[PDB]
Every structure is written in structure tokens, then in C-alpha cells.
Design a protein around this ligand. Structure first.
Ligand SMILES: [Ca+2]
Length: 770
């Protein structure tokens, strides 16, 4: 630790000249923090040649860049030695190309004097032309070094929950002269599946065949009450190619399942479809990990007022699986839908023995999804094809070249001059064990940002897209995510050895370094983060407690960064006017005519307490980030190592902007702005002029104040009225030095015996919980 490397480190590890079943590889560390490794080379025991290149994202304190040569021989693994390049050598940004001595544990040359050949070049974040500039022109080329390139001529529909009722949204005027109009996710998916004529491809972490997609009696749709299972079986019986890849939840980790973290129905679904014309494949990770992508791909009629007989591809990505517990609206009711839309869809995994017959609260489900049109839709389909080819069933993917006269070649849905147009790019966390067709040669892999893992090539373009989206930010960042933990290389060694945690992804540290850079420049900037009150499961459980502890350490790292920057500027200010954390909750007075359960919970349980207090969190399952009202990422990937790693859970996400609605010379007032405002209206219960510019001090102060008011209403012993909104200040305090503290009287979440600050586990290894 001397030298902050915040930027990108281009590296090539060529070879070891001469070492005087062997599987030789080299790792790259920034001080103690691992940042890359080569593939393993066989049949070259004396002169291993990797010729492997890296584009390493740096946000690290370091004195030495350390290359370790190792042999992963199954009969025994061995350390060959270490080579050191001082950070002084790269800090000025000039290219370094060196043959450096490999040394033993006493820093003496290893036998024979072997040297490793490496090339390095450090690019500080401000060397990037979008650093602190946003997207900054309609000619922005996309995120570099990714497998999928940015697509033009696209259209994205943004979905706020599974469903939205009639006339929900206030008037949110947009640059083109109309008001923002919310789209409805499961109505649209129902239509997409019902109208497909050639293919329906679905992936899910969980699929439940017995749910209906359409349930709003005020917005009925013909056939909308059919279950998704009966709908898919009908379409397949008519000849549509219906292919599902559902995570093999038979491989779950028992301890996580028992704690409530894996409430899935994939196996049940496979039994539902076998014998039908639906091809439902149970897909193991290849477990400790899961297949977490949530995908729907269909053929759809080509936009054409008169009609073209032709078809195009349309794809959905985001957080919402087609399973139990996901249907909801921004009302997020705890008790008042138990005899309507949740009577047969009661989801509450946070109490032992929760059941509709014992009453609510159910767990409301806040989530975000998207529909993708234009060439990007084929990229999602290509992901499905890669996975099916590797882990699917028979050779029954639709062959798009045999259908050139039926399904168009990948094509835009709008002209690039149309201000509604989107530029969209697809990102993933997946590896060669799960997806066929990645390039084998190191040069081609590096051009796509693919990195070597222990045994497979790795796509980590989701983490890369997040890093890039944060670095170009200039006004504000708004995050909703199921998890918020990581950058453990920069955690305090406070009762832990940080290097043992291995939650190395950069998102939390990039956020705090971005905040620090703006403070240093005296430029206004705000970061808003909405997380669930606790991650789904029994909150007293080892798993949930471990996650809250990781979350606490992550928050503490960031606030210490912020406070240190404020103090260096001579500022004494509340760091929560720079970085602010929220969760969501609801609370409903018992009005006449509500569902009356036949039974009750046991007398001194979380369940009984929550039922009597009439309150519960609204679960934040979203995985979305909005930057500057101009760029948005929506997908399946949580802000944790499980999602960001690349070789842990498989994930997918899109990142997009409208090139004519950027935040450059005018405020961004396109679809992303409309959506962000619609989300804020849902959570705050109101819109206010100050919310138009979330970088302002007046905005964050007002949002924070409202969220404190709602926490007071939520957590009070007394209840007179429904909660007027849902956004709660996350129930922690920030000490003057950045330590996260309990609130007075709230060691535990309301109605629970669960510590808000969490508990480090002595049994669960961090690989399971990070
Ligand atoms: Ca919602």
C-alpha cells in the first residue's frame, strides 16, 4: 500500500524462459489482492508460454505487482516462485516490458535463475474519455472488451414490477413532448408467449408451472388466466419449439436451502412438462452455484402497420423469474390481496411455517425487468443457444438460416435519427463450462475481455459494464439491488483477514472512489442505494446474518472513504448527503372486509409479531442501476461476488441508453428519466420538483428526510394510517469515523430477533455467502 491504482492495467504474461501432470499457470496480484490468472499449460514443463493478455480493473492500494508461478498438478500442486514489479514502475502510465527474476520465499532467485516476461501499462481513470463525462455523445461506442458489442437501432421497455394498475403514474413530461407511460411486464410476456409461432426459449433460476401471468380483474386479457405451464404445453403441442433451461435445484446447497435462500421449484416444473412437447432441461451449474439468468426469447410479428408476414426476435431480461411470489404491483400489499391475486400465490419465506391459512403479511416483491427489441434481442437468443449447446437436450434449436424468409436477419426497429431509439449492449457472468462457442486462442479471448479461470474461460462483462457505468458518472447513481457487498480487498482487518473473504469485485469501491473524486473537485454528486431490509430467508439464520455482516463491512469501507475525503476538504458534513442507503417497507391498517385466516401463528414468533404489528419489508429483488438519468443496467446480477465473479452464478444483464436523450448539454429527459421518476413516485409516494435533479443537496436532503419519516411510521409501536410511502432509511447509523452503528432501540429488525448489523459465521465459508 503506497500508490492508489484506480484505472485499468493492461497486462500480458508471455512466458517463463526456462524452469530448471504438470499444469503451469501464473497469477497477478496487486499487493495481496488477486486480480488475474493465466490458463494452465500442459506439455511445456520447462518453457510455459501463455501469451495471455488482461485488461485489469484497478481500485487498489499497492506497492508491488506480484506474479506467482504455480503448478496445479493433481498429484500435488506446488509454488514455483514470485516475481515483483514495483508500482513505481507503472504509476506514470508508461509502458513497462520486462524480464523479471522469479524468487523463492526468501526473495532469492529460484534454482537456475528463471525469469518471467511481462508487459504492463497503467491507465488512470481520468485517461478515459468518458471519465466524469457520462455517455457524452450519440457516437459512444459501447463498453470495450466484451463478448457482445453494443447494438444500434434497438428499443427497450422498462418494467417496474410484474404489473402496474391503471393510471398509476403521475404526469412525468419527457423531452419528446409526451408523458412517461409505464409498460406492464407480465401482460407483455403473456402476449409474447401466446403469439409466438416458431420458438419460445426460457431460462430461470426457478419456474413454477402453476402461476397465471395475468390476474388484474380490471385489465382482463383473453386466456390470461391460463397457467404458464398450460400455456407452454399448448404452444408446444401446436408445433412451437418450446425449450427451457431451468436451474437444477436438485443440486442446491443444503445449508442455504434450510436457511431459506433457495426457495425454487425447478424440479417440480420438469416433472410437469415431461411427456409434453415442452423440452424442459434441468441445468446444473457445473453446484456450489446456480444458474441465475432469467430469460424469455420469442419470435414476434415484425412492426408493420399493413403487415409483413415476417417475424423478428424479442427478448426479456431482468430480475423477475416466472415463478411463485413474483407477481405484484407498486401497491405491494401485505394483507389486502390475500383473497385476490395472492390467494393461490402466497409467498413468505421469512417465517417458519408461513401459510395463507395462518395469515399475512405476505412478502411483497419489488423487482425490475426489461423487454429488448432490435439486434440486441438476438444476442440474448445467442446466449440461450450457447447454453443449450453445452448443457441442453437434443439438437433442436431453431436454425435461423433455414428461416431467412420467415424470421428476419437481426435488424433495427427504429432509425438511428429517431429520438426514441436505444443503443443497447448485452453483458453476462458465465464461463465455458456452461456456454459453448467461446474463442480458444488468447488473442481472441482478450479482445472480448474473457479471462482465464481455474479450468474454464470466463465472461465477466457484467462487472465490467458496472465499473464503466460508475466511472463515467457525473451527476448521480441510483441503485436497487438484492445484495450490496464486495470489494473485500479494501475492507478493514476488523476481526477478519480480508484476503480470506475473496469478494474481490469492484462495485462498492468504485462507487466510493467516484464519490471521493467528486468531493475533491467540489462537484455535486449523490449515490442512492436501495437494498432489502434483509435478504430473503429466516433473518436469524447463519446465512442471512453472514450476509448482513458482509453488507455492514462494505458500507463501513465506503463511509470511511467518504468521511476521509470530506475531512481533507475541511468539510464537516453528514456523509449521508453523499452516500445514502434505504430499504423498502409497508404497513397497513386493518380495514373492514379483509381476508380472515382460519388459523394463527404461534404466540411468540416473528410471524405473530409481524402479523399483529401489520408491517413487513417490501422485498427488493431488483438488480438495476441508473446513472445520470441517461444510462441503465437491468439484469439478474446482484452486487455480490456470486453474481459479479463470472465463474460463480450465471447471470445476464443489458445496459442501454437513448443516444438522443443524454445528460450532456440538456438534462436527460427520456425513458430512463421517466422510469427513475416513476420508481421514486412508487417508493416516496409523491413527486417533487427537487427530484428532477438528484445531484442536488436539496434532493438528497428531502429524500433522506422523507425516508426517516417513513422509518418512524414503520417502526412505531402505534399505527393510525397506512404507510404513505415505502422508502425507509436503512436502519443503521454512521459514526463520526465511519463505523456502522445500531440505531437506539433497534439491535434487531422490528418484530424479529435478528441483528441488523449481522453476525459473522464460524461455520459457513465466505464462498457460500459472498
Ligand atoms: Ca415495486
Amino acid at each position: 500500500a503506497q500508490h492508489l491504482l484506480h484505472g485499468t492495467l493492461h497486462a500480458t504474461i508471455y512466458e517463463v524462459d526456462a524452469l530448471h501432470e504438470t499444469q503451469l499457470y501464473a497469477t497477478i496480484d496487486l499487493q495481496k489482492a488477486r486480480v488475474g490468472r493465466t490458463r494452465k499449460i500442459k506439455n511445456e514443463p520447462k518453457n510455459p508460454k501463455w501469451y495471455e493478455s488482461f485488461h485489469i480493473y484497478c481500485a487498489h492500494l499497492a506497492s508491488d505487482i506480484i506474479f506467482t508461478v504455480k503448478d496445479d498438478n493433481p498429484i500435488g500442486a506446488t509454488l514455483i516462485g514470485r516475481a515483483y514489479i514495483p508500482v513505481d514502475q507503472v504509476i506514470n502510465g508508461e509502458e513497462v516490458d520486462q524480464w523479471v527474476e522469479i524468487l523463492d520465499n526468501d526473495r532469492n532467485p529460484i534454482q537456475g535463475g528463471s525469469k518471467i516476461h511481462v508487459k504492463l501499462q497503467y491507465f488512470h481513470v481520468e485517461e478515459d474519455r468518458n471519465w466524469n463525462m457520462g455517455i457524452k455523445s450519440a457516437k459512444f461506442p459501447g463498453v470495450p472488451y466484451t463478448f457482445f458489442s453494443q447494438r444500434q437501432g434497438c428499443k427497450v421497455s422498462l418494467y417496474q414490477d410484474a404489473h402496474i394498475p391503471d393510471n398509476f403514474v403521475p404526469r412525468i413530461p419527457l423531452a419528446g413532448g409526451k408523458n412517461y407511460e409505464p409498460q406492464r411486464c407480465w401482460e407483455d410476456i403473456f402476449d409474447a408467449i401466446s403469439n409466438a409461432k416458431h420458438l419460445i426459449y426460457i431460462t430461470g433460476w426457478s419456474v413454477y408451472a402453476e402461476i397465471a401471468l395475468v390476474r388484474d380483474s380490471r385489465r382482463p386479457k383473453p386466456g390470461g388466466d391460463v397457467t404458464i405451464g398450460e400455456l407452454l404445453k399448448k404452444k408446444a403441442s401446436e408445433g412451437v419449439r418450446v425449450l427451457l433451461l431451468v436451474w437444477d435445484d436438485r443440486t442446491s446447497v443444503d445449508v442455504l436451502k434450510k436457511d431459506g435462500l433457495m426457495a425454487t421449484h425447478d424440479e417440480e416444473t420438469e416433472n410437469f412438462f415431461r411427456g409434453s412437447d415442452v423440452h424442459c432441461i434441468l441445468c446444473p451449474r457445473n453446484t456450489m452455484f446456480t444458474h441465475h439468468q432469467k430469460i424469455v426469447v420469442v419470435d414476434s410479428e415484425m412492426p408493420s402497420r399493413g403487415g409483413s408476414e415476417m417475424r423478428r426476435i424479442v427478448s426479456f431480461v431482468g430480475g423477475i423469474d416466472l415463478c411463485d411470489g413474483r407477481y405484484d404491483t407498486p401497491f405491494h400489499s401485505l394483507f389486502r390481496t390475500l383473497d385476490t391475486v395472492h390467494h393461490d400465490d402466497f409467498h413468505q419465506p421469512n417465517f417458519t411455517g408461513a401459510a395463507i391459512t395462518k395469515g399475512g403479511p405476505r412478502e411483497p416483491w419489488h423487482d425490475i425487468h426489461s423487454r429488448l427489441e432490435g439486434p440486441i434481442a438476438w444476442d440474448v437468443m445467442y446466449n440461450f443457444e450457447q447454453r443449450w449447446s453445452k448443457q441442453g437436450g437434443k439438437d433442436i434449436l431453431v436454425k435461423l438460416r433455414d428461416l431467412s424468409d420467415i424470421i428476419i436477419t437481426p435488424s433495427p426497429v427504429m432509425f438511428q435519427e429517431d429520438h426514441d431509439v436505444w443503443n443497447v449492449q448485452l453483458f453476462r457472468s458465465i464461463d465455458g463450462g456452461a456456454a459453448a462457442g467461446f474463442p480458444e486462442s488468447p488473442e481472441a479471448a482478450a479482445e472480448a475481455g474473457l479471462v482465464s479461470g481455474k479450468d474454464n474461460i470466463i465472461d465477466r462483462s457484467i462487472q465490467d459494464a458496472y465499473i464503466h457505468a460508475i466511472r463515467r458518472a457525473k451527476d448521480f447513481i441510483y441503485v436497487e439491488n438484492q445484495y450490496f457487498l464486495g470489494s473485500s480487498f479494501a475492507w478493514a482487518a476488523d476481526g477478519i483477514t480480508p484476503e480470506d473473504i475473496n469478494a474481490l469485485h469492484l462495485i462498492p469501491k468504485e462507487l466510493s472512489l467516484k464519490i471521493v473524486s467528486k468531493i475533491e473537485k467540489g462537484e455535486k454528486f449523490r449515490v442512492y442505494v436501495v437494498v432489502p431490509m434483509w435478504p430473503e430467508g429466516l433473518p436469524e439464520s447463519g446465512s442471512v446474518q453472514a450476509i448482513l455482516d458482509w453488507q455492514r463491512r462494505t458500507m463501513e469501507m465506503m463511509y470511511k472513504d467518504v468521511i476521509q475525503a470530506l475531512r481533507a476538504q475541511g468539510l464537516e458534513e453528514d456523509p449521508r448527503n453523499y452516500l445514502t442507503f434505504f430499504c423498502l417497507g409497508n404497513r397497513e391498517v386493518k380495514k373492514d372486509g379483509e381476508y380472515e385466516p382460519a388459523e394463527k401463528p404461534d404466540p411468540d414468533t416473528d410471524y405473530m409479531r409481524a402479523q399483529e404489528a401489520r408491517r413487513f419489508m417490501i422485498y427488493v429483488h431488483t438488480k438495476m442501476m441508473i446513472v445520470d438519468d441517461e444510462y441503465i443496467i437491468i439484469g439478474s446480477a446482484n452486487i455480490n461476488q456470486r453474481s459479479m465473479d463470472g465463474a460463480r452464478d450465471s447471470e445476464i444483464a443489458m445496459g442501454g441508453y437513448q443516444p438522443h436523450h443524454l445528460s450532456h448539454r440538456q438534462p436527460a429527459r427520456g425513458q430512463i428519466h421517466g422510469f427513475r421518476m416513476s420508481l421514486w413516485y412508487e417508493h416516496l409516494g409523491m413527486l417533487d420538483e427537487t427530484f428532477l435533479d438528484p445531484s442536488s443537496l436539496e434532493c438528497i436532503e428531502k429524500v433522506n428526510r422523507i425516508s426517516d419519516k417513513y422509518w418512524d411510521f414503520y417502526s412505531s409501536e402505534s399505527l393510525e394510517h397506512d404507510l404513505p410511502g415505502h422508502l425507509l432509511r436503512y436502519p443503521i447509523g454512521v459514526a463520526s469515523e465511519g463505523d456502522i452503528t445500531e440505531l437506539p432501540g433497534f439491535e434487531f429488525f422490528p418484530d424479529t430477533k435478528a441483528r441488523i448489523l449481522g453476525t459473522k459465521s464460524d461455520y459457513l465459508p465466505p464462498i457460500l455467502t459472498t
